[PDB]
Symmetry: D2
Subunit: 499 residues, 4 copies
């Protein structure tokens, strides 16, 4: 009856932590302790950073072609071991097997995009700016980088963070979430088996202690974070204070706009899948719906569609949404629903008291739909991050756009309509960096960049894409001048260069 311990990854060797404080890993479907992740000690984190620094020079001096082949073999291994990572994700995080497979597939797509380093790391040149003078620039790695991933995406966020940084020539110190480290450990093992030199990738687990270590250590040049607003802002501030570039994606309150001329059944199915998919534990979940004009008549049909969802453990066949991450999240969602009810909101569907056969101890919360919600309610201002859908009613699209713009969180939004003018007006007037036309989850594919907004993102450059490549890299502009008279030594030049 010995609980397995999550191994660290320092210097290319899976080593057990020598710390005293341990964090228990619970299965959200049964709340049973399945493992223990340790809090990395000062000495262990120091050794990890030292290994990253020692591997930086050799890994950077290595040609980009070798890193490309390494990442290609890593993507191959991911393809080979996709179902194992999906099962580990369903076990730790609790999301449905299909959700874990989609997560691993999006991570694989991000890796495959990163495999284009040959074309992404290309610089620029300008010959003959002046007589016998040239100008060109190079893209070079920054140094030791760090990453902090959330619990809702055990595999997608690490594959966003560390592959891009490593392939560009950096060495990454990945700090995965303390609730789902198994996916990150499997990814690190697959990377080590793909030819990655020892010390290039290192992993440490721990609570705010590790975050402070990452944000305070001077040898770390870049920090990537995805998670809540509080932790994201704290990390961004603590990083910028020491001079580290930090890109942090924070909570979101994406709004869905349903126009009267939109496809009824398809729009309702999309709303359901996006609001209750993965138990709503996504930074891109369409947790808010705005029914414009005659769209108010679709509330009964939306509730009927939401009633057809199956709430069961992730590993069970036919499951739609899994349980929540921890009982604390369930209590928070229940308290937020209670507050919404106390503020005058009407609940059309209530799944708080749902009970699953064989999983009575799991953190399950059924689909919840709240109507008559106003912008001044707590359930609207606070990020539910669960299987709850708040619905607002407006008479014109102008009011919907105004409501969307007034909300601080703008990670993404979607408008459903069959009229091109309406979609164009919405996409042009809405102050959201990720707009979706008939698409509820407008997650930009890897070749593009995850375009955060005012409140749902901090920093300057995005996570992946060309933005991602530019973030983990720095430009070295070289102004070269080779006078023609120096090609054949005849006499020294006594004239300073003049345009």
């Amino acid at each position: 009856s010995s609980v397995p311990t999550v191994k660290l990854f320092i210097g290319g060797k899976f080593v057990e932590s020598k710390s005293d404080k341990w964090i228990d890993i619970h299965n959200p479907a049964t709340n049973e302790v399945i493992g223990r992740v340790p809090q990395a000690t000062k000495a262990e984190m120091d050794a990890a950073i030292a290994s990253c620094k020692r591997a930086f020079p050799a890994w950077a001096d290595t040609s980009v072609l070798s890193r490309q082949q390494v990442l290609l073999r890593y993507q191959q291994l991911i393809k080979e071991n996709l179902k194992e990572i999906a099962k580990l994700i369903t076990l730790e995080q609790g999301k449905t097997l299909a959700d874990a497979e989609g997560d691993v597939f999006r991570g694989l797509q991000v890796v495959e995009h990163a495999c284009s380093v040959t074309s992404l790391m290309m610089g620029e040149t300008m010959p003959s700016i002046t007589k016998d003078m040239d100008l060109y620039s190079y893209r070079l790695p920054l140094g030791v980088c760090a990453g902090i991933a959330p619990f809702n995406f055990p595999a997608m966020i690490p594959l966003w963070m560390f592959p891009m940084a490593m392939v560009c020539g950096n060495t990454f110190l990945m700090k995965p979430s303390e609730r789902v480290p198994g996916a990150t450990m499997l990814l690190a093992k697959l990377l080590q088996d793909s030819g990655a030199p020892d010390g290039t990738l290192n992993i440490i687990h721990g609570q705010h202690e590790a975050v402070n270590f990452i944000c305070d250590h001077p040898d770390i040049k870049a920090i990537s974070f995805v998670g809540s607003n509080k932790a994201g802002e704290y990390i961004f501030e603590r990083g910028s204070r020491h001079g580290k570039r930090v890109q942090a994606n924070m909570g979101a309150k994406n709004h869905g706009v349903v126009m009267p001329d939109a496809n009824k059944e398809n729009t309702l199915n999309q709303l359901v899948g996006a609001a209750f998919g993965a138990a709503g534990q996504r930074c891109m979940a369409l947790s808010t719906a705005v029914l414009v004009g005659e769209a108010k008549k679709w509330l009964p049909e939306l509730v009927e569609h939401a009633k057809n969802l199956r709430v069961n453990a992730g590993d069970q066949p036919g499951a739609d949404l899994g349980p929540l991450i921890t009982p604390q999240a369930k209590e928070r969602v229940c308290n937020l629903i209670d507050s919404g009810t106390k503020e005058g909101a009407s609940i059309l569907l209530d799944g708080r008291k749902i009970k699953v056969k064989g999983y009575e101890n799991g953190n399950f919360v059924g689909p919840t739909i709240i109507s008559n919600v106003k912008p001044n309610m707590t359930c609207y201002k606070e990020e539910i991050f669960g299987p709850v859908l708040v619905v607002l009613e407006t008479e014109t699209l102008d009011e919907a756009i105004q409501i969307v713009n007034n909300n601080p969180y703008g990670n993404g939004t979607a408008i459903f309509t069959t009229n091109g003018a309406t979609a164009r007006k919405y996409a042009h007037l809405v102050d959201v960096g990720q707009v979706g036309v008939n698409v509820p989850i407008p997650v930009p594919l890897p070749m593009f960049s995850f375009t955060g907004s005012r409140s749902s993102f901090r920093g300057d450059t995005n996570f992946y894409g060309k933005q991602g490549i530019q973030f983990y890299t720095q430009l070295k502009t070289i102004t070269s001048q080779w006078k023609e008279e120096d090609a054949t030594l005849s006499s020294p030049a006594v004239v300073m260069p003049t345009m």
Copy 2:
């Protein structure tokens, strides 16, 4: 005997400030008061920000073509008034007419690069990522931007900051240096004459009060700064604290590596021009020279070449370098030279006690050359920002590269040599974002980007170039699905999209 007052540019009108606190403008060649710049009051700065916000919507909704026409006409007007701004800069800042004309010409080049907005604001697209699904991204402005420029470039840095934001569709709240506001006033007048809508560009003047206002007001999205390390770090921290993206080019310490096989006379001329040009008051001036191997023998010739420079007022014919900005700068430079002398340094040429005919009251300091300097000396660690050149000697290029890497400031560096292998080795091993091969001032043209480094820059994105355009813009990714069955309404779709 009334001293002219520098008027504020708020709402497209040159208005005199009602503030009771005034700062006198002294001519550095004679220390005669030639003008006064007021500290903008709270109400005036609020009105300026309100005008910027009111102009933002209309200016952004304006087609990029009209902004390109505006930028082209502004470049034309600058060309028509180049020598006027040059004389105004020579009067206020004190730099020789040649340096002022060069500053204005480089700012004109920056503006002309900005005129390429049409080819730089183009987004990306991806057709048919999924059946009847498309993906694309748009570049859009941020909002009200701000800029804080130093005194050593009354025109170049303002034309780095505000034209880029203007052409991209953003409204700019520019804060020029209190010591040289006339150039910015002339530039704003020429811009208003080019057809820029009233209120699009607003200018305020003041001491740390205005900086705090800019860094604290929430309606400001981006801040650009160039200057010292203390003020740069302060502004960057105060901005990032409030969620604003900030790019701050801080102090620098450039090193000039002289190899034995380099062109003797040309290398010496370049070193002299870059160390004493513009009175050494430049962030890219080669205040440090590293004589590698047999380059030690060139110290007498370097001193002889430096002795041929003419120190006179900026408006006198044949003036090579003008006086310093203020007597405080002269006192600081003299105290730094004294400290260097105390620490064992050897002064080969001393210009502290120089006296100019007819300008005995000016802040003139002749060419100064210090030798036997070590990395641990005050004159080496502190940014002189004046007509002083500290020389170091090394037996091998490896030691020079090590010295350059240990130095925190890496704004730019130059290596002089006729061997391609040596230049390549230096450019590859040196940790400087701007390397120069036989080029003493490796300032990248506006088409490239000013690639800052570890200490000479704080932020993620550079000032001008593609990075400059990206800094003042944000990406809006749009994912649209247009299922074929919706083109010919026959029956509603009851199937959710599946990739």
Copy 3:
């Protein structure tokens, strides 16, 4: 009185031609001979090519910055002389003053896009492909280039051809249409006034001898043509035969698809303006209209709207469309209308017998609308190139797309509809390189490229845009290796480079 003779532009000097063969220039509104253009003799063309070759080296060695300044001043001069060029175009070609101003404005936009040569001429680099090995490429000019422009655009197409090629460093041998050379002469004079070195631009005139000379001379590297199918194919073949890269925009047949849900009045206005604008002599005019489904009911309203057009000389106030280029074009259009009538087609509006007050000698042809046209009719297969609109009726959008794909000409097409799904389906299934959604004239702006198609273009690279820049330039890839051991000569290297 004497008739003015068009001067040749050789060596920067407007010289009178010694040719014995002359072509009269007739005013299309009164058929009065307003000028004569000579056929350049063999010696004159040889001298022009010699001047181009002599100017090539100096103009190419000239830094890109100087060429950018020259082109900016040329754009300024165009802005200063826009109305004069428009008046000259209205006098020679006959198009309305507004049409000539739009032509000159589009040419000015093309020039302003060309101003971005600094960012467009950028290359690529890949540092450290192997140990001590670098790789980069450069964009360089081709050499002497030539251009053959049609009559329908005396200014737009010349400004597409010669400015783009010249700013990249090439020397252009322009060849304008023998019917409208005055606009090209004025443009060349303005360019010479902008500071362009003499001999960089040379211009000759001729019908077939000049074309054969341009296609046969070996010193010409690139040829740009716009016009009919016969001449385009002939020039393309004669150029490819001699190893010259040739881009030839040929005739077109645009189809306007009108869906039932489109904006009735706006769609009709756009159709009228695009079918009868500029006397329908444009290569992008919607000479064909496809009424899908219930769109058949709009034929009476379309005819009524077309009846409101004013047919008068180009210089008269309120003139909507001017006369044709020559009596031969009028006879051709009349014979094509007669053939269409003889093939079963129905004419709703007949303007062949139109007579204008005071301009009875002008080649005026009123708006003509043909209905019941089938794909097998002569008027449908032949390019009318006049104020004639053939209307077809389809039962579904699939039939319209099939008809559009079956037509060999695909220069451009437009679909009018308020449903986004329909527009997406059309743009995806239509085999046309330039599609328009509610836009009748989908002429891409300068920053994009004029994307030819199956029959309306012969070649690989487009005219303007990034493709336009690439067409008049060639890549020079430089694989440079500088071993570190050569930086410090100690012993010769006896090992061949190995990956």
Copy 4:
């Protein structure tokens, strides 16, 4: 023992040809018949083109992601089966096992570059060019493509041609060289095993009938060729005559410039490896060497180094260069050497009468070095394409540059020197699209495009790189306009769009 017959790859099935004409495959090391390749009949080529056309729609409609995964798995299979293809190449073509491995490795690098289709096919967009108007473009496939590869690269050039067109969405009809079809058969089998739909790739064999079919079939949109000048020009003409874009790489006479300050031993080793590597049967081999100034003294050392090469069969250990392709090539090389001797040339090393132990019947020709060669000699003007090195001598670098510029073939060139000024001067003044600084084989990596020149290349767009994607694709520019008034139907619009 019966001779194995090469199979045709039509409709995704390896089938034997019913043609009565067969071409024997001879092992160049023993001239023994190892296989036969049939000349595809008219019916078989028609069926192949029909399969390509039938596969084009489904393959193009397939998302780019699926094609990316297909190319990734194909690169994986190539990595797995690299040694088998290398052995097949050594057997058929005769090149050393190391040469075949390098061929397959470069082809694999090209495939990996093609895997970046997600980033290369991305279009452009310019939002808000006019009120409620957008503009964007899409990269789309052309159609059925064809390829004709030479014998000296059984795998490298096929992997240049067909993978690029495949991943872009085009169906390819690859015609490999009749002398080395086994490598192409293995590559097609591996591709079919990688998930490529049946009929997407088709292969036919022949000498002239297949070429005429490819150049005359109207369903073929693009043709890619590499080989001799005669065949390249013939194919380019026959293609452009029918309206097909053709890119044809042709013979080369690359020159190697050796400066006195260059690394003696390393330069000589590089010259030997590049002139005699792969038996000189390469389009980038340095068959010409220019000894500038004091470089004349290195002829004895060059001959001594060339004498150390081992001439043996490709599959034998320690082999440096294999035998020629056919006895006709050996006879041609010997006759060219004889003609050069008759014209006054001096042969320092003669390998014509070389005899290999155990391979007396093979087409082996030892290293040959010719000196005192002039530009007007036959051996200089004619492409030897064998293990022959003609050496020229010049007193200054200007003379060498003039000699290189006067030569028509400019596929590539290399200059050896330790002085940056000389290298820059050469790279700037030499009229060659591929310049090498201390690199004998300046073959651009797949990320860069092949940049052949005046006589060594015909066409507009280059083979691979971004140019490769641009060649096998076409841009579809879409000018979209959605007026805001149409989003909320209230009244029809009676105003035509106006800027």
